[PDB]
Amino acid sequence: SGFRKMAFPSGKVEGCMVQVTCGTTTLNGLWLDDVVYCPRHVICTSEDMLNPNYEDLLIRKSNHNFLVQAGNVQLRVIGHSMQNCVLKLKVDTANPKTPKYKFVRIQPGQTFSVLACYNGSPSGVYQCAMRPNFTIKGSFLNGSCGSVGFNIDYDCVSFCYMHHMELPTGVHAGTDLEGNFYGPFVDRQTAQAAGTDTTITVNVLAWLYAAVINGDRWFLNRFTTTLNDFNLVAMKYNYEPLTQDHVDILGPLSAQTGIAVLDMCASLKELLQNGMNGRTILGSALLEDEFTPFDVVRQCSGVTFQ
Amino acid sequence: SGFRKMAFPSGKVEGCMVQVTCGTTTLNGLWLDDVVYCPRHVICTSEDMLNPNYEDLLIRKSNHNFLVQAGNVQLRVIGHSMQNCVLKLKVDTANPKTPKYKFVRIQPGQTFSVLACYNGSPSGVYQCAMRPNFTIKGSFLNGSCGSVGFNIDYDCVSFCYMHHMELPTGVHAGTDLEGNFYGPFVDRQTAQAAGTDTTITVNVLAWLYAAVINGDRWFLNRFTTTLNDFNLVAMKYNYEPLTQDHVDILGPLSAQTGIAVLDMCASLKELLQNGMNGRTILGSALLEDEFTPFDVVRQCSGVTFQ
């Protein structure tokens, strides 16, 4: 029993983290077979970050200007290429710890684990959600750019995120592993607005189902509701609207618990309009939206990985 | 910036998890050099758990009754020994993934990472605290016994915990890696009372210092207080009393933030007697006690590991 914000085991990713240095700047890189993926702003100094012309900067750089280090071994950069915001640093040796991997562009509301690294060395791992405004509320100090987010499909690591920037608001922005930012952000030290951040309703519902499974039932109310009527209230509290696809995804949880998805929505509706009144759900005083319906089923069924 | 309940990278431990089978029962084991540590109740069936005589049960078992498996390779048990609650299964091959390790018995209030495993395969990792009543509020399904808790001293894994039992109250009990339970618990399927669970005050104070560092300052109050007077209020709200040793440990945080430890205590005192009034601290509506002062300094300074 019990419920925790569990991260994926990080071992398969720890073996892929390297230190990349270009000039004075040093950040983290992702060493898959013979390419080292890293933020392209590794080529920038603090001044360049205010208004960087990446094409012009990269052209000033050559293969021998990139120092890639893994532990106490050095990697030779035999080629460099820029893919939208990522530097692909082709090195001479393929990473022997290269796992079965996949590059995936996740959707907002999906969760993944972040391996926070400094100088190419792992410092910790945590599970987070891609917010609906494509930011992540992470924990990144100076020199953590290039840290990656990932999921594990039992033997296959799905890399979905690379950290690039801390917005002046203290939230974090980054790309997929093809260098395409999540959201409207650019890798420039300028004021950048992230959208309104909404609560991931399908995730909250998934977590309420976890609460029931683990014995928290007080929020099961005497009401029901319609999908149209629930969404009306969700909009007022900055919850993203629920679709039938979200209902279909919650199916297995509905079947395990005997609670129809629309009945759970009525419970959540009342939680929204009347609060939790100094009571908790799974040790939390706030409604949690960083567990997907799959996380809950994974954790409540104990699926393992390689 | 930002703050997350970060777990240690799990890779060095993933390589030590094995599946141990004795009869019908199968749980997790810890494969360090040529010993496999696992809960001794692996030798018990469901009936034996109600009233097990472990000496008499183990004597009915022989070396060939223990099936230790790592992935798709099998380990031969060349010896078996029982150390207080742990089975030391001597196998014929030393774990080549054996990290620099240490067995440590932690004190309540200290934090560590748990690698939750099923069938010897890792399913996820989370950071938790040893509660003052020597339980852990974990996430353990059937077949997760033997999962281990650990800290990492940059190249040295300090194994401090092995999960043995879920108490009928849904909380979790286990031992150090010498088989000595944390707390008054026994590995028997009987009703067992854990003590009153108090909040780890030095940890809450450490986390308030993290709040200040990350820009949360509203709880900084107009009051001060004495250590004797603060402890008087802490006792009322089931907070463990603060000692000068706790004050000495918070020193570096006091120096970084310019806030004297006794001033932070006055802030916490008012938080206790008047609540948080629908406001948050680091995204939390409750006071967090699963960050030690070392966790905060580690996370706020970005220390890395091997």
Short mmCIF file of C-alpha atoms in Angstrom, two decimals, chain B:
data_model
loop_
_atom_site.label_atom_id
_atom_site.label_comp_id
_atom_site.label_asym_id
_atom_site.label_seq_id
_atom_site.Cartn_x
_atom_site.Cartn_y
_atom_site.Cartn_z
CA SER B 1 16.08 27.69 -8.81
CA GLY B 2 13.17 25.54 -7.65
CA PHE B 3 12.93 22.74 -5.11
CA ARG B 4 12.00 19.07 -5.53
CA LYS B 5 11.98 15.96 -3.33
CA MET B 6 14.98 14.61 -5.18
CA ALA B 7 16.04 10.99 -4.86
CA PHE B 8 19.61 9.86 -5.30
CA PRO B 9 20.44 8.42 -8.73
CA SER B 10 19.65 4.74 -8.42
CA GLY B 11 22.04 3.19 -10.95
CA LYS B 12 24.60 1.93 -8.44
CA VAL B 13 21.80 0.08 -6.61
CA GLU B 14 19.89 -1.24 -9.65
CA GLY B 15 22.92 -3.41 -10.39
CA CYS B 16 22.64 -5.03 -6.95
CA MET B 17 18.97 -6.10 -6.97
CA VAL B 18 18.24 -9.79 -7.43
CA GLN B 19 15.22 -12.05 -7.22
CA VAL B 20 15.30 -14.55 -4.35
CA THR B 21 12.89 -17.48 -4.29
CA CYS B 22 12.42 -19.96 -1.45
CA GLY B 23 9.47 -22.26 -2.03
CA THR B 24 6.47 -20.35 -3.34
CA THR B 25 7.59 -17.04 -1.84
CA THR B 26 9.67 -14.69 -3.97
CA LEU B 27 11.04 -11.30 -2.91
CA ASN B 28 14.02 -9.02 -3.59
CA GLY B 29 17.62 -9.46 -2.51
CA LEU B 30 20.68 -7.21 -2.36
CA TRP B 31 23.67 -8.72 -4.21
CA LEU B 32 26.87 -7.28 -2.76
CA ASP B 33 30.09 -8.84 -3.45
CA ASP B 34 29.26 -12.53 -2.90
CA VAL B 35 26.45 -12.24 -0.32
CA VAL B 36 22.77 -11.80 -1.14
CA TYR B 37 20.97 -9.98 1.66
CA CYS B 38 17.22 -10.52 1.82
CA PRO B 39 14.46 -10.64 4.43
CA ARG B 40 14.52 -13.94 6.29
CA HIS B 41 10.75 -14.33 5.90
CA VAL B 42 11.48 -15.43 2.32
CA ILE B 43 11.52 -18.91 3.91
CA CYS B 44 7.94 -18.46 5.16
CA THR B 45 4.64 -19.28 3.51
CA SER B 46 1.55 -17.19 4.27
CA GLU B 47 0.66 -19.53 7.14
CA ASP B 48 4.15 -19.43 8.65
CA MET B 49 4.02 -15.62 8.79
CA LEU B 50 1.41 -15.67 11.56
CA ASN B 51 3.76 -17.34 14.05
CA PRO B 52 7.17 -18.13 12.52
CA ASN B 53 9.95 -19.97 14.33
CA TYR B 54 12.72 -18.80 12.00
CA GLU B 55 15.41 -21.09 13.40
CA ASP B 56 13.19 -24.15 12.96
CA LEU B 57 12.08 -23.02 9.50
CA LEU B 58 15.58 -22.26 8.24
CA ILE B 59 16.81 -25.66 9.41
CA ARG B 60 14.15 -27.25 7.20
CA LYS B 61 15.69 -25.30 4.29
CA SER B 62 18.95 -26.14 2.52
CA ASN B 63 21.25 -24.29 0.12
CA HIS B 64 19.53 -25.81 -2.91
CA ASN B 65 16.12 -24.52 -1.74
CA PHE B 66 17.13 -20.91 -2.50
CA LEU B 67 16.76 -19.72 -6.10
CA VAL B 68 18.60 -16.43 -6.66
CA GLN B 69 18.13 -14.91 -10.12
CA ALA B 70 19.56 -11.75 -11.70
CA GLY B 71 17.93 -10.97 -15.03
CA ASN B 72 18.10 -14.26 -16.93
CA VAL B 73 21.20 -15.61 -15.13
CA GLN B 74 20.94 -17.91 -12.13
CA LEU B 75 23.06 -17.74 -8.97
CA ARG B 76 24.06 -20.86 -7.04
CA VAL B 77 23.64 -20.59 -3.26
CA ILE B 78 26.79 -22.09 -1.72
CA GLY B 79 25.86 -21.02 1.82
CA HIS B 80 23.05 -19.56 3.93
CA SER B 81 23.25 -17.65 7.20
CA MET B 82 20.74 -15.66 9.25
CA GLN B 83 21.76 -12.34 10.85
CA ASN B 84 18.94 -11.24 13.21
CA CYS B 85 16.32 -10.73 10.49
CA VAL B 86 18.33 -10.87 7.25
CA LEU B 87 19.32 -13.92 5.26
CA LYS B 88 22.91 -13.80 4.04
CA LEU B 89 22.84 -16.07 0.98
CA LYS B 90 26.43 -16.77 0.00
CA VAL B 91 26.51 -17.33 -3.76
CA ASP B 92 29.34 -18.50 -5.98
CA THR B 93 29.90 -15.35 -8.09
CA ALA B 94 30.69 -11.88 -6.81
CA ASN B 95 28.45 -9.14 -8.21
CA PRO B 96 30.56 -7.36 -10.86
CA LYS B 97 28.34 -4.30 -10.43
CA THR B 98 29.18 -4.13 -6.71
CA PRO B 99 29.64 -0.44 -5.83
CA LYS B 100 31.73 1.09 -3.11
CA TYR B 101 29.26 0.56 -0.29
CA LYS B 102 28.75 1.01 3.42
CA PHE B 103 26.20 -0.40 5.85
CA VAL B 104 24.87 2.40 8.05
CA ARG B 105 22.18 2.48 10.72
CA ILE B 106 20.52 5.87 10.32
CA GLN B 107 18.73 7.83 12.98
CA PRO B 108 15.07 8.87 12.76
CA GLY B 109 14.53 12.07 10.82
CA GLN B 110 17.28 11.18 8.36
CA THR B 111 16.38 10.81 4.70
CA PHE B 112 17.29 8.23 2.08
CA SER B 113 16.17 7.00 -1.33
CA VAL B 114 14.16 3.80 -1.77
CA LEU B 115 14.54 1.67 -4.89
CA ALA B 116 11.19 -0.15 -5.00
CA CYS B 117 11.61 -3.51 -6.73
CA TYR B 118 9.42 -6.47 -7.66
CA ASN B 119 10.82 -9.87 -8.69
CA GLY B 120 14.28 -8.34 -8.36
CA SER B 121 13.55 -5.75 -11.07
CA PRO B 122 13.47 -2.02 -10.23
CA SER B 123 10.13 -0.28 -10.65
CA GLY B 124 10.83 3.19 -9.26
CA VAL B 125 12.79 5.33 -6.84
CA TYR B 126 11.65 7.83 -4.24
CA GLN B 127 13.08 9.85 -1.38
CA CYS B 128 11.61 9.43 2.08
CA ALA B 129 12.42 10.05 5.73
CA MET B 130 12.80 7.60 8.54
CA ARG B 131 9.94 8.75 10.76
CA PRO B 132 10.68 9.37 14.46
CA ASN B 133 8.65 6.21 15.19
CA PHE B 134 11.06 4.23 12.95
CA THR B 135 8.49 3.55 10.24
CA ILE B 136 8.54 4.74 6.66
CA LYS B 137 5.53 5.93 4.68
CA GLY B 138 6.49 4.05 1.54
CA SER B 139 4.92 2.58 -1.58
CA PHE B 140 5.34 -1.20 -1.43
CA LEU B 141 3.15 -3.79 -3.11
CA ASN B 142 3.21 -7.54 -2.52
CA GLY B 143 6.63 -8.83 -3.52
CA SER B 144 8.53 -5.62 -2.74
CA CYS B 145 10.12 -6.87 0.48
CA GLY B 146 13.87 -6.68 0.23
CA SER B 147 13.81 -3.32 -1.56
CA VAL B 148 16.57 -1.19 -0.09
CA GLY B 149 17.00 2.38 1.04
CA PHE B 150 20.30 4.14 0.46
CA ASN B 151 22.28 7.37 0.38
CA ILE B 152 25.25 8.19 -1.86
CA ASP B 153 28.45 9.79 -0.50
CA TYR B 154 29.66 10.74 -4.01
CA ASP B 155 31.15 7.34 -4.82
CA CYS B 156 30.07 5.29 -1.81
CA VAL B 157 26.57 3.89 -1.46
CA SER B 158 25.43 3.84 2.16
CA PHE B 159 22.76 1.15 2.42
CA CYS B 160 20.63 1.98 5.44
CA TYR B 161 17.31 0.20 4.94
CA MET B 162 15.72 -3.03 3.77
CA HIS B 163 11.94 -3.30 3.59
CA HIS B 164 10.40 -6.24 5.44
CA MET B 165 6.76 -5.65 6.41
CA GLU B 166 3.73 -3.52 5.72
CA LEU B 167 2.06 -2.92 9.05
CA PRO B 168 -1.74 -3.43 9.10
CA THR B 169 -1.88 0.38 9.25
CA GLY B 170 -0.37 0.60 5.76
CA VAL B 171 2.99 1.93 6.93
CA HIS B 172 6.24 0.10 6.35
CA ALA B 173 8.83 -1.45 8.65
CA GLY B 174 12.25 -2.85 7.96
CA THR B 175 15.79 -3.31 9.10
CA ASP B 176 19.29 -2.05 8.60
CA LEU B 177 21.54 -4.25 6.50
CA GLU B 178 22.56 -6.16 9.61
CA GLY B 179 18.97 -7.33 10.05
CA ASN B 180 18.24 -5.15 13.10
CA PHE B 181 14.77 -3.70 12.75
CA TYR B 182 14.29 0.01 12.92
CA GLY B 183 11.87 0.33 15.82
CA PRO B 184 10.08 -2.26 17.97
CA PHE B 185 8.84 -4.33 15.05
CA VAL B 186 9.19 -8.05 14.45
CA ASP B 187 8.85 -9.89 11.14
CA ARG B 188 5.63 -11.63 12.11
CA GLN B 189 2.14 -11.16 10.65
CA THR B 190 0.67 -9.84 13.89
CA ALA B 191 -0.78 -6.51 14.95
CA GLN B 192 2.16 -4.27 15.83
CA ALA B 193 1.91 -0.74 17.21
CA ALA B 194 4.21 1.97 15.91
CA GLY B 195 4.75 4.87 18.27
CA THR B 196 3.29 8.33 17.98
CA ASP B 197 4.70 9.81 14.77
CA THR B 198 6.13 13.30 15.29
CA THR B 199 7.19 15.92 12.78
CA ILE B 200 10.95 16.31 12.28
CA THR B 201 11.38 19.95 13.32
CA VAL B 202 15.02 20.37 12.27
CA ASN B 203 13.93 19.17 8.81
CA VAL B 204 11.01 21.61 8.65
CA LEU B 205 13.41 24.41 9.60
CA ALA B 206 15.83 23.23 6.91
CA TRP B 207 13.00 23.36 4.38
CA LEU B 208 11.94 26.84 5.49
CA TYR B 209 15.53 27.89 4.77
CA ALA B 210 15.11 26.38 1.30
CA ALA B 211 11.92 28.41 0.92
CA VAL B 212 13.77 31.65 1.71
CA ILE B 213 16.59 30.73 -0.67
CA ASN B 214 14.05 30.17 -3.46
CA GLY B 215 12.22 33.44 -2.76
CA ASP B 216 9.46 32.35 -0.36
CA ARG B 217 9.75 34.91 2.43
CA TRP B 218 6.20 35.77 3.59
CA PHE B 219 6.52 33.55 6.68
CA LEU B 220 9.49 35.58 7.94
CA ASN B 221 7.72 37.19 10.88
CA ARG B 222 8.19 40.18 13.18
CA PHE B 223 8.92 37.94 16.19
CA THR B 224 11.82 36.14 17.80
CA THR B 225 11.80 33.43 20.47
CA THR B 226 13.90 31.29 22.78
CA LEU B 227 14.87 27.67 22.26
CA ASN B 228 13.04 26.76 25.47
CA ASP B 229 9.95 28.71 24.41
CA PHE B 230 9.95 27.31 20.87
CA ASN B 231 10.19 23.74 22.15
CA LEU B 232 7.18 24.35 24.41
CA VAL B 233 5.06 25.04 21.33
CA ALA B 234 6.67 22.27 19.26
CA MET B 235 5.59 19.71 21.87
CA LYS B 236 1.95 20.77 21.53
CA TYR B 237 1.87 20.15 17.76
CA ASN B 238 3.72 16.80 17.86
CA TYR B 239 7.00 18.33 16.71
CA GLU B 240 10.17 16.83 18.10
CA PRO B 241 12.08 19.23 20.39
CA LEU B 242 14.99 21.23 19.00
CA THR B 243 18.44 20.91 20.56
CA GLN B 244 21.57 23.00 20.24
CA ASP B 245 22.92 20.24 17.99
CA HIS B 246 20.02 20.95 15.63
CA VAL B 247 20.89 24.65 15.87
CA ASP B 248 24.53 23.88 15.09
CA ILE B 249 23.49 21.82 12.06
CA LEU B 250 21.44 24.71 10.67
CA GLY B 251 24.45 27.05 10.93
CA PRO B 252 25.43 27.10 7.24
CA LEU B 253 21.82 27.78 6.25
CA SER B 254 21.66 30.61 8.78
CA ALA B 255 24.89 32.07 7.37
CA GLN B 256 23.78 31.86 3.73
CA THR B 257 20.41 33.52 4.37
CA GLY B 258 21.23 36.01 7.14
CA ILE B 259 18.38 34.60 9.24
CA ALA B 260 19.34 33.43 12.72
CA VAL B 261 18.11 29.94 13.60
CA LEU B 262 16.09 31.29 16.52
CA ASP B 263 14.42 33.78 14.17
CA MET B 264 13.41 30.94 11.86
CA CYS B 265 12.00 29.10 14.88
CA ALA B 266 9.83 32.11 15.72
CA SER B 267 8.58 32.04 12.13
CA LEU B 268 7.82 28.34 12.46
CA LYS B 269 6.22 28.86 15.87
CA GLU B 270 3.72 31.28 14.33
CA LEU B 271 3.16 28.93 11.40
CA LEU B 272 2.24 26.25 13.93
CA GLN B 273 -0.11 28.29 16.14
CA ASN B 274 -1.81 30.15 13.28
CA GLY B 275 -1.48 27.84 10.27
CA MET B 276 -0.70 28.80 6.69
CA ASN B 277 -4.19 30.24 5.97
CA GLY B 278 -4.65 28.80 2.51
CA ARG B 279 -1.16 29.85 1.42
CA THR B 280 1.73 27.69 0.23
CA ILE B 281 5.47 27.31 0.82
CA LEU B 282 7.42 25.85 -2.12
CA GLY B 283 4.13 24.69 -3.65
CA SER B 284 3.13 22.91 -0.43
CA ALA B 285 0.12 23.54 1.81
CA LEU B 286 1.69 21.45 4.61
CA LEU B 287 5.01 21.79 6.40
CA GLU B 288 7.53 19.39 4.85
CA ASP B 289 9.83 17.36 7.08
CA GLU B 290 11.50 14.99 4.59
CA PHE B 291 14.40 17.32 3.75
CA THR B 292 17.33 17.30 6.15
CA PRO B 293 19.57 20.37 6.45
CA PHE B 294 22.07 18.44 4.34
CA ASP B 295 19.54 17.73 1.59
CA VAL B 296 18.80 21.45 1.36
CA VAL B 297 22.48 22.43 1.16
CA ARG B 298 23.13 19.60 -1.32
CA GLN B 299 20.25 20.72 -3.53
CA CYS B 300 20.93 24.44 -3.16
CA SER B 301 24.64 23.94 -3.96
CA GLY B 302 24.34 21.14 -6.53
CA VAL B 303 26.69 18.49 -5.17
CA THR B 304 27.15 15.57 -7.58
CA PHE B 305 28.12 11.91 -7.20
CA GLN B 306 29.97 9.23 -9.17
#
